[PDB]
Structure 1
Amino acid sequence: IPQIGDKFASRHGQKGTCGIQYRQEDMPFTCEGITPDIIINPHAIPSRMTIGHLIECLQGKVSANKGEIGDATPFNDAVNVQKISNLLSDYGYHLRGNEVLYNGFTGRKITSQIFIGPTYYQRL
Structure 2
Amino acid sequence: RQNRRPELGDKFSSRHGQKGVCGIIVKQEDMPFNDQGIVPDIIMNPHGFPSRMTVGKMIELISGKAGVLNGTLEYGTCFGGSKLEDMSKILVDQGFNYSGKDMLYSGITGECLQAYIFFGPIYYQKLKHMVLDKMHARARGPRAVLTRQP
Same fold (TM over 0.5): yes
Q: How many Å apart are 1:17 and its aligned residue?
A: 0.9
CA–CA separation in structure 1 for the residues paired with 2:67 and 2:110: 29
Matching residue of 2:121: 118
Q: In the alignment, is residue 63 of structure 1 matched against residue 67 of structure 2?
A: yes
Q: How many Å apart are 1:65 and its aligned residue?
A: 0.5
Q: Percent identity?
A: 50
Q: How many Å apart are 1:90 and its aligned residue?
A: 1.1
Could you say which structure has the greater relative contact order, defined with CA pairs below 8 angstroms and 6 or more residues apart? 1
Q: Which amino acid aligns with 1:54?
A: M
4+ runs of 1 displaced by more than 4 Å? none
- Within-5 A mapping of 1:33-112: 33-76=37-80, 79-112=82-115
Q: TM-score with structure 1 length normalisation?
A: 0.94
Could you tell me which of 10, 18, 25 is aligned with 1:6? 10
Q: Which amino acid aligns with 2:45?
A: N
- Deviations along 1:53-91, one digit per CA (max 9) or x if unpaired, are 110000000011111101111112x63322221221111
Work out the number of aligned pairs and report it: 123
User: Which sections of structure 2, spanning at least 5 residues, go unmatched?
Assistant: 128-150
Q: How many Å apart are 1:31 and its aligned residue?
A: 1.0
CA–CA separation in structure 2 for the residues paired with 1:47 and 1:17: 19
**Which structure shows the bigger proportion of residues in strand conformation?**
2
CA–CA separation in structure 2 for the residues paired with 1:15 and 1:38: 13
What is the DSSP-based 3-state SS (H/G/I as helix, E as strand, rest coil) of the residue aligned with 1:119? strand
What is the DSSP-based 3-state SS (H/G/I as helix, E as strand, rest coil) of the residue aligned with 2:52? coil
What is the DSSP-based 3-state SS (H/G/I as helix, E as strand, rest coil) of the residue aligned with 2:75? coil
CA–CA separation in structure 1 for the residues paired with 2:38 and 2:7: 21
CA–CA separation in structure 1 for the residues paired with 2:70 and 2:54: 25
